[PDB]
Amino acid sequence: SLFSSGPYEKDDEEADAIYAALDKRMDERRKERREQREKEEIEKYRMERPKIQQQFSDLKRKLAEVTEEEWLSIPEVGD
Amino acid sequence: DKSKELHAIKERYLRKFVFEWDASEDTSIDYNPLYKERHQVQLLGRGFIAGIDLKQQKREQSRFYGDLMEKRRTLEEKEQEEARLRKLRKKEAKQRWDDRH
Amino acid sequence: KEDMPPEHVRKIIRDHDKRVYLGALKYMPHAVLKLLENMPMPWEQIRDVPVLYHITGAISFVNEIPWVIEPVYISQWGSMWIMMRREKRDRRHFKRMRFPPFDDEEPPLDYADNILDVEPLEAIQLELDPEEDAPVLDWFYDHQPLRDSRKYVNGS
Amino acid sequence: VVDSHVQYRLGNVDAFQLADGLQYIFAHVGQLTGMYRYKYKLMRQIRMCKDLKHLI
RNA sequence: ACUCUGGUUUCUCUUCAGAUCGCAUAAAUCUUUCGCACUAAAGAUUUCCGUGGAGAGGAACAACUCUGAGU
């Protein structure tokens, strides 16, 4: 932002609140339908778009079951 | 034309901000004469296209409707038409009378 | 929320914590579009319009919309075309502006000083003969032709 | 455009001259505005304005 | 010919609208398409440009010309 976030004040808070309220009011025309459609699309994409984290999420959840002896006896891969 | 017509029959059987659209991208190059020189929309000798100069549009008329009008109208109708044309010419002259330098 | 005379807005513009001004500046393109839409037609000499003068004064948007009766606008356009053809065929020594305005770096001219005083020249209003233009003699030229005729138009 | 309107209302040029100036400031204005480089997509609108100018 | 709920204008809000919502016409993103995409098409999405429907509230001046209705 070209305007530094530093120089704010209570009048700045009031002006920002008024501007944000106006923007939100002017953005609520198709906001409900757009939000519902986007949520449905995200749910659909969740079927074919697993995060790398999600990929190993099931394994990583069960992986914590290894005990301290199990988590310390892991041999070096050189042998 | 003729060779172009035969070639067309055979064919049917088998960065840079360009400002002005070049004439290469234009259409309406038709080999056939019937679809190239077509009779214009002569509105029964009483109308013409829009925008173009009314005097120029009426001057370049086909005169086909005018011949029928002058060979079919009655003598009294001809006199009334002559009076109307005289009135129109007088109006044009009055317009021409207001032009000076 | 009663209105105010434009003189106050003009004085504020000539006179004017940068919070309020910066916050409301986010809608300049809407004001530009409104100004483009509400430009005067050739048939009109001066077209007074209502605007929304911001308290900070960063952007003033013309609240009005250019709603015009279709046949009246078509007639105005046809009369303008006829008058333009006549002027072109008559005033062959036509010197179009065909150049940017002289303010390359000059300050913007004060609309109060150099624009609110000189009476503008006559616009392109084709002559109206009362023999055939009588029913539309007064209704032919106006900023809003039927802004008051209840019988002819819906109203304001 | 606003300055051309002001000049029309300042008595610098005639109303017909103002209409000609507006026609110039709208048609064949891509050279004057130079907005094609900023957004290449506007070149379609510029070509449409050029075609409208040619027809008119 | 008796009477009667029934005035329009205008401002604001909410909600719905795939009807040419608009006899007008843009923008952006993704997707597929041959490139090697202002100069290009297709499918979708989204925001503007501004509408119609209905409801609700408000202030201006018409009170029954009108029409529907109660003869």
Side-chain angles (χ1 to χ4, degrees), chain A residues 6-7 15 17 20-21 50 64 75 78, chain B residues 8 23 33 45 47 50-51 66 83 93, chain C residues 5-6 23-24 29 31 40 42 50 57-58 66 71 78 100-101 107-108 112 120 123 130 134-135 145 155, chain D residues 11 15 19 21 26-27 30 34:
Chain D
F26 283 139

Short mmCIF file of all heavy atoms in Angstrom, two decimals, chain A residues 2-75, unseen atoms left out:
data_model
loop_
_atom_site.label_atom_id
_atom_site.label_comp_id
_atom_site.label_asym_id
_atom_site.label_seq_id
_atom_site.Cartn_x
_atom_site.Cartn_y
_atom_site.Cartn_z
N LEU A 2 0.59 2.17 -0.91
CA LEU A 2 1.35 3.41 -0.97
C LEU A 2 1.17 4.26 0.28
O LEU A 2 2.04 5.09 0.58
CB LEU A 2 0.95 4.22 -2.21
N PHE A 3 0.07 4.08 1.00
CA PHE A 3 -0.17 4.79 2.25
C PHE A 3 0.30 3.92 3.41
O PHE A 3 -0.19 2.80 3.59
CB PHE A 3 -1.65 5.15 2.40
N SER A 4 1.25 4.43 4.19
CA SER A 4 1.76 3.68 5.33
C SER A 4 0.66 3.46 6.36
O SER A 4 -0.15 4.36 6.64
CB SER A 4 2.94 4.42 5.97
N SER A 5 0.62 2.26 6.94
CA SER A 5 -0.38 1.92 7.94
C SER A 5 -0.18 2.65 9.25
O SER A 5 -1.08 2.62 10.10
CB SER A 5 -0.37 0.41 8.18
N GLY A 6 0.96 3.31 9.45
CA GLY A 6 1.25 4.02 10.67
C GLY A 6 0.29 5.16 10.97
O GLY A 6 -0.43 5.14 11.98
N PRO A 7 0.25 6.17 10.10
CA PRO A 7 -0.55 7.37 10.40
C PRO A 7 -2.05 7.12 10.39
O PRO A 7 -2.74 7.48 9.43
CB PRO A 7 -0.14 8.34 9.29
CG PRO A 7 1.22 7.91 8.89
CD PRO A 7 1.21 6.41 9.01
N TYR A 8 -2.56 6.51 11.46
CA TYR A 8 -3.99 6.33 11.66
C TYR A 8 -4.42 7.06 12.93
O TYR A 8 -3.60 7.55 13.71
CB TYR A 8 -4.34 4.84 11.76
N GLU A 9 -5.74 7.13 13.13
CA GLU A 9 -6.31 7.83 14.28
C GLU A 9 -7.77 7.40 14.43
O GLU A 9 -8.27 6.56 13.68
CB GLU A 9 -6.18 9.35 14.13
N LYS A 10 -8.44 8.00 15.41
CA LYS A 10 -9.86 7.70 15.63
C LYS A 10 -10.71 8.20 14.47
O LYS A 10 -11.66 7.53 14.05
CB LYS A 10 -10.32 8.31 16.95
N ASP A 11 -10.40 9.40 13.96
CA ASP A 11 -11.08 9.87 12.76
C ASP A 11 -10.78 8.96 11.58
O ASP A 11 -11.66 8.71 10.74
CB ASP A 11 -10.66 11.31 12.45
N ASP A 12 -9.55 8.45 11.50
CA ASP A 12 -9.23 7.46 10.49
C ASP A 12 -10.06 6.20 10.67
O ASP A 12 -10.53 5.61 9.69
CB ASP A 12 -7.74 7.12 10.53
N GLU A 13 -10.27 5.78 11.92
CA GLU A 13 -11.11 4.62 12.18
C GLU A 13 -12.54 4.86 11.71
O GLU A 13 -13.14 3.99 11.07
CB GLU A 13 -11.09 4.28 13.67
N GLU A 14 -13.09 6.04 12.00
CA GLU A 14 -14.46 6.34 11.58
C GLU A 14 -14.57 6.38 10.06
O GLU A 14 -15.52 5.83 9.48
CB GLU A 14 -14.91 7.66 12.19
N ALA A 15 -13.62 7.04 9.39
CA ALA A 15 -13.66 7.12 7.93
C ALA A 15 -13.51 5.74 7.30
O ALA A 15 -14.21 5.42 6.33
CB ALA A 15 -12.56 8.06 7.43
N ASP A 16 -12.61 4.92 7.83
CA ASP A 16 -12.44 3.56 7.32
C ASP A 16 -13.69 2.74 7.53
O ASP A 16 -14.09 1.96 6.66
CB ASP A 16 -11.23 2.90 7.98
N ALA A 17 -14.34 2.88 8.69
CA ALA A 17 -15.58 2.16 8.95
C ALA A 17 -16.66 2.57 7.96
O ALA A 17 -17.37 1.71 7.42
CB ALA A 17 -16.04 2.39 10.38
N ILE A 18 -16.80 3.87 7.71
CA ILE A 18 -17.82 4.34 6.77
C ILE A 18 -17.54 3.82 5.37
O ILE A 18 -18.44 3.34 4.67
CB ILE A 18 -17.91 5.87 6.80
N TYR A 19 -16.28 3.90 4.94
CA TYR A 19 -15.92 3.44 3.60
C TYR A 19 -16.14 1.94 3.46
O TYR A 19 -16.65 1.47 2.43
CB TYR A 19 -14.46 3.80 3.30
N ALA A 20 -15.76 1.16 4.48
CA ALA A 20 -15.95 -0.28 4.42
C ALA A 20 -17.43 -0.65 4.42
O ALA A 20 -17.84 -1.59 3.73
CB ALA A 20 -15.22 -0.95 5.59
N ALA A 21 -18.24 0.07 5.21
CA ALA A 21 -19.67 -0.18 5.20
C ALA A 21 -20.26 0.11 3.83
O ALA A 21 -21.09 -0.67 3.32
CB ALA A 21 -20.36 0.66 6.27
N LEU A 22 -19.85 1.22 3.21
CA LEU A 22 -20.34 1.54 1.87
C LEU A 22 -19.92 0.47 0.86
O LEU A 22 -20.72 0.05 0.02
CB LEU A 22 -19.83 2.91 1.44
N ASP A 23 -18.67 0.02 0.93
CA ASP A 23 -18.19 -1.00 0.01
C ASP A 23 -18.94 -2.31 0.19
O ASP A 23 -19.32 -2.97 -0.79
CB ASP A 23 -16.69 -1.22 0.20
N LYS A 24 -19.17 -2.72 1.45
CA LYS A 24 -19.90 -3.95 1.71
C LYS A 24 -21.34 -3.85 1.23
O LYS A 24 -21.88 -4.82 0.67
CB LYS A 24 -19.85 -4.28 3.20
N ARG A 25 -21.98 -2.70 1.44
CA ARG A 25 -23.33 -2.50 0.93
C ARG A 25 -23.37 -2.58 -0.59
O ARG A 25 -24.28 -3.19 -1.17
CB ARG A 25 -23.88 -1.16 1.41
N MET A 26 -22.38 -1.99 -1.26
CA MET A 26 -22.33 -2.01 -2.71
C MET A 26 -21.82 -3.33 -3.27
O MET A 26 -21.78 -3.49 -4.49
CB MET A 26 -21.44 -0.87 -3.22
N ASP A 27 -21.44 -4.28 -2.42
CA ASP A 27 -20.94 -5.58 -2.85
C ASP A 27 -21.90 -6.72 -2.52
O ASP A 27 -21.57 -7.88 -2.74
CB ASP A 27 -19.57 -5.86 -2.24
N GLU A 28 -23.08 -6.41 -1.98
CA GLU A 28 -24.03 -7.41 -1.54
C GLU A 28 -25.12 -7.70 -2.57
O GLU A 28 -26.12 -8.35 -2.23
CB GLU A 28 -24.67 -6.98 -0.22
N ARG A 29 -24.96 -7.22 -3.80
CA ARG A 29 -25.96 -7.46 -4.83
C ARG A 29 -26.12 -8.95 -5.11
O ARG A 29 -27.19 -9.53 -4.88
CB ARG A 29 -25.59 -6.71 -6.11
N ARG A 30 -25.06 -9.59 -5.59
CA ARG A 30 -25.06 -11.02 -5.85
C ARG A 30 -24.16 -11.78 -4.88
O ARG A 30 -23.72 -12.89 -5.18
CB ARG A 30 -24.64 -11.31 -7.29
N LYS A 31 -23.87 -11.19 -3.71
CA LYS A 31 -22.90 -11.77 -2.79
C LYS A 31 -23.36 -13.13 -2.27
O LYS A 31 -22.56 -14.06 -2.15
CB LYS A 31 -22.64 -10.82 -1.63
N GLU A 32 -24.65 -13.26 -1.95
CA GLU A 32 -25.14 -14.52 -1.39
C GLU A 32 -25.05 -15.66 -2.40
O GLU A 32 -24.51 -16.73 -2.10
CB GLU A 32 -26.58 -14.35 -0.90
N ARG A 33 -25.59 -15.44 -3.61
CA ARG A 33 -25.55 -16.47 -4.63
C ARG A 33 -24.12 -16.79 -5.04
O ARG A 33 -23.76 -17.96 -5.22
CB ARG A 33 -26.37 -16.03 -5.85
N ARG A 34 -23.28 -15.76 -5.20
CA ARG A 34 -21.89 -15.98 -5.55
C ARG A 34 -21.17 -16.79 -4.48
O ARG A 34 -20.40 -17.70 -4.80
CB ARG A 34 -21.18 -14.65 -5.79
N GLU A 35 -21.40 -16.46 -3.21
CA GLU A 35 -20.76 -17.19 -2.12
C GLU A 35 -21.21 -18.64 -2.09
O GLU A 35 -20.39 -19.55 -1.91
CB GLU A 35 -21.05 -16.51 -0.79
N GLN A 36 -22.51 -18.88 -2.26
CA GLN A 36 -23.01 -20.26 -2.26
C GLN A 36 -22.42 -21.05 -3.42
O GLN A 36 -21.99 -22.20 -3.25
CB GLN A 36 -24.54 -20.26 -2.33
N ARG A 37 -22.39 -20.45 -4.61
CA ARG A 37 -21.83 -21.14 -5.77
C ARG A 37 -20.34 -21.41 -5.59
O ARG A 37 -19.85 -22.49 -5.95
CB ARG A 37 -22.07 -20.32 -7.04
N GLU A 38 -19.60 -20.45 -5.04
CA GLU A 38 -18.17 -20.64 -4.81
C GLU A 38 -17.92 -21.73 -3.78
O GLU A 38 -16.98 -22.51 -3.92
CB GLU A 38 -17.53 -19.32 -4.38
N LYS A 39 -18.75 -21.78 -2.73
CA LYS A 39 -18.60 -22.84 -1.74
C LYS A 39 -18.88 -24.21 -2.35
O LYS A 39 -18.15 -25.18 -2.08
CB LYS A 39 -19.54 -22.58 -0.55
N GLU A 40 -19.91 -24.31 -3.19
CA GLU A 40 -20.19 -25.57 -3.87
C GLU A 40 -19.05 -25.96 -4.79
O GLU A 40 -18.67 -27.14 -4.87
CB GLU A 40 -21.50 -25.47 -4.64
N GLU A 41 -18.48 -24.98 -5.50
CA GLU A 41 -17.36 -25.27 -6.39
C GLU A 41 -16.12 -25.71 -5.62
O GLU A 41 -15.40 -26.61 -6.06
CB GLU A 41 -17.04 -24.04 -7.24
N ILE A 42 -15.86 -25.09 -4.47
CA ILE A 42 -14.74 -25.51 -3.63
C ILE A 42 -14.95 -26.92 -3.12
O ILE A 42 -14.02 -27.74 -3.09
CB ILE A 42 -14.53 -24.51 -2.48
N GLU A 43 -16.17 -27.24 -2.69
CA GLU A 43 -16.47 -28.59 -2.24
C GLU A 43 -16.26 -29.60 -3.36
O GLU A 43 -15.71 -30.69 -3.14
CB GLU A 43 -17.91 -28.67 -1.72
N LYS A 44 -16.68 -29.26 -4.58
CA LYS A 44 -16.46 -30.14 -5.72
C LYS A 44 -14.97 -30.31 -6.02
O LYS A 44 -14.51 -31.42 -6.30
CB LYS A 44 -17.20 -29.61 -6.95
N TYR A 45 -14.21 -29.21 -5.98
CA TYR A 45 -12.78 -29.27 -6.26
C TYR A 45 -12.03 -30.03 -5.18
O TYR A 45 -10.94 -30.56 -5.45
CB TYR A 45 -12.21 -27.86 -6.42
N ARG A 46 -12.57 -30.10 -3.97
CA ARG A 46 -11.94 -30.87 -2.91
C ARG A 46 -11.90 -32.37 -3.23
O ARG A 46 -11.12 -33.10 -2.61
CB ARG A 46 -12.66 -30.65 -1.58
N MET A 47 -12.70 -32.80 -4.20
CA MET A 47 -12.71 -34.20 -4.58
C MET A 47 -11.52 -34.55 -5.46
O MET A 47 -11.06 -35.69 -5.46
CB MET A 47 -14.01 -34.54 -5.32
N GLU A 48 -11.02 -33.57 -6.21
CA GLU A 48 -9.91 -33.84 -7.13
C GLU A 48 -8.67 -33.01 -6.85
O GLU A 48 -7.70 -33.07 -7.60
CB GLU A 48 -10.37 -33.62 -8.57
N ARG A 49 -8.70 -32.22 -5.78
CA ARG A 49 -7.55 -31.38 -5.45
C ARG A 49 -7.09 -31.56 -4.01
O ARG A 49 -7.34 -30.70 -3.17
CB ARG A 49 -7.89 -29.90 -5.71
N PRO A 50 -6.43 -32.69 -3.73
CA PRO A 50 -5.91 -32.93 -2.38
C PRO A 50 -4.61 -32.19 -2.16
O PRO A 50 -3.70 -32.28 -2.99
CB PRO A 50 -5.68 -34.43 -2.36
CG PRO A 50 -5.38 -34.78 -3.78
CD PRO A 50 -6.14 -33.81 -4.64
N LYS A 51 -4.50 -31.47 -1.05
CA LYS A 51 -3.27 -30.76 -0.74
C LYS A 51 -2.17 -31.76 -0.45
O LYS A 51 -2.43 -32.86 0.05
CB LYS A 51 -3.47 -29.84 0.46
N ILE A 52 -0.93 -31.38 -0.74
CA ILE A 52 0.18 -32.26 -0.45
C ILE A 52 0.11 -32.64 1.01
O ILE A 52 0.34 -33.79 1.38
CB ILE A 52 1.53 -31.59 -0.74
N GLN A 53 -0.22 -31.67 1.86
CA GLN A 53 -0.36 -31.95 3.28
C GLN A 53 -1.49 -32.95 3.49
O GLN A 53 -1.32 -33.92 4.24
CB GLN A 53 -0.65 -30.66 4.05
N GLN A 54 -2.62 -32.73 2.83
CA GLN A 54 -3.74 -33.64 2.98
C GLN A 54 -3.32 -35.03 2.56
O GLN A 54 -3.69 -36.01 3.20
CB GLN A 54 -4.92 -33.17 2.13
N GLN A 55 -2.54 -35.11 1.50
CA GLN A 55 -2.06 -36.39 1.02
C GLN A 55 -1.50 -37.22 2.17
O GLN A 55 -1.98 -38.32 2.44
CB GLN A 55 -1.01 -36.20 -0.06
N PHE A 56 -0.48 -36.69 2.84
CA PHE A 56 0.15 -37.43 3.92
C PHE A 56 -0.53 -37.18 5.27
O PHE A 56 0.00 -37.61 6.30
CB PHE A 56 1.63 -37.06 4.01
N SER A 57 -1.68 -36.50 5.28
CA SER A 57 -2.34 -36.18 6.54
C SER A 57 -2.77 -37.44 7.28
O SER A 57 -2.57 -37.55 8.49
CB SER A 57 -3.54 -35.27 6.28
N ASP A 58 -3.37 -38.40 6.56
CA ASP A 58 -3.80 -39.64 7.20
C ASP A 58 -2.61 -40.41 7.77
O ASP A 58 -2.68 -40.94 8.88
CB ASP A 58 -4.58 -40.50 6.21
N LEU A 59 -1.52 -40.48 7.01
CA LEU A 59 -0.32 -41.14 7.52
C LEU A 59 0.29 -40.37 8.68
O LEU A 59 0.69 -40.97 9.69
CB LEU A 59 0.70 -41.31 6.39
N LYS A 60 0.37 -39.04 8.56
CA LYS A 60 0.97 -38.24 9.62
C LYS A 60 0.19 -38.33 10.92
O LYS A 60 0.77 -38.23 12.01
CB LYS A 60 1.09 -36.78 9.18
N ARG A 61 -1.13 -38.51 10.84
CA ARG A 61 -1.93 -38.67 12.05
C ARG A 61 -1.57 -39.96 12.78
O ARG A 61 -1.33 -39.95 13.99
CB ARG A 61 -3.42 -38.66 11.70
N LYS A 62 -1.50 -41.08 12.05
CA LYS A 62 -1.12 -42.34 12.66
C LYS A 62 0.37 -42.43 12.96
O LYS A 62 0.76 -43.20 13.84
CB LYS A 62 -1.54 -43.51 11.76
N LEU A 63 1.20 -41.66 12.25
CA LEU A 63 2.64 -41.74 12.45
C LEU A 63 3.07 -41.35 13.85
O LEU A 63 4.14 -41.77 14.31
CB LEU A 63 3.36 -40.85 11.42
N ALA A 64 2.27 -40.54 14.55
CA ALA A 64 2.61 -40.14 15.91
C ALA A 64 2.55 -41.29 16.91
O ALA A 64 3.02 -41.12 18.04
CB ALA A 64 1.68 -39.01 16.37
N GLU A 65 1.99 -42.43 16.52
CA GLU A 65 1.86 -43.58 17.42
C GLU A 65 3.19 -44.29 17.68
O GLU A 65 3.23 -45.18 18.53
CB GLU A 65 0.85 -44.57 16.86
N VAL A 66 4.25 -43.93 16.97
CA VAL A 66 5.55 -44.57 17.18
C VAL A 66 6.13 -44.10 18.50
O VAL A 66 6.21 -42.90 18.78
CB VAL A 66 6.50 -44.26 16.01
N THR A 67 6.54 -45.06 19.33
CA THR A 67 7.05 -44.76 20.66
C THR A 67 8.45 -44.15 20.58
O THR A 67 9.07 -44.08 19.51
CB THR A 67 7.07 -46.02 21.52
N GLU A 68 8.94 -43.70 21.73
CA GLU A 68 10.26 -43.08 21.79
C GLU A 68 11.35 -44.06 21.37
O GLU A 68 12.28 -43.70 20.65
CB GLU A 68 10.53 -42.54 23.19
N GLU A 69 11.25 -45.31 21.83
CA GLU A 69 12.19 -46.34 21.38
C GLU A 69 12.06 -46.57 19.88
O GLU A 69 13.06 -46.72 19.18
CB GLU A 69 11.96 -47.64 22.15
N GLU A 70 10.82 -46.61 19.37
CA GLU A 70 10.61 -46.73 17.94
C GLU A 70 11.14 -45.51 17.19
O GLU A 70 11.69 -45.64 16.09
CB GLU A 70 9.12 -46.93 17.64
N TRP A 71 10.99 -44.32 17.77
CA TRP A 71 11.45 -43.08 17.15
C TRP A 71 12.93 -42.82 17.38
O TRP A 71 13.44 -41.79 16.93
CB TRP A 71 10.64 -41.90 17.67
N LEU A 72 13.64 -43.73 18.05
CA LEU A 72 15.07 -43.61 18.26
C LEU A 72 15.88 -44.74 17.66
O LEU A 72 17.09 -44.57 17.45
CB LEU A 72 15.39 -43.52 19.76
N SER A 73 15.26 -45.89 17.38
CA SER A 73 15.95 -47.04 16.82
C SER A 73 16.07 -46.98 15.30
O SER A 73 16.61 -47.91 14.70
CB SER A 73 15.24 -48.33 17.22
N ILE A 74 15.56 -45.92 14.67
CA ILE A 74 15.59 -45.78 13.21
C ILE A 74 17.04 -45.81 12.73
O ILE A 74 17.81 -44.88 13.00
CB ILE A 74 14.90 -44.48 12.77
N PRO A 75 17.44 -46.86 12.02
CA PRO A 75 18.84 -46.98 11.59
C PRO A 75 19.18 -46.02 10.47
O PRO A 75 18.32 -45.54 9.72
CB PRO A 75 18.95 -48.44 11.12
CG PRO A 75 17.63 -49.09 11.49
CD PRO A 75 16.64 -47.99 11.53
#
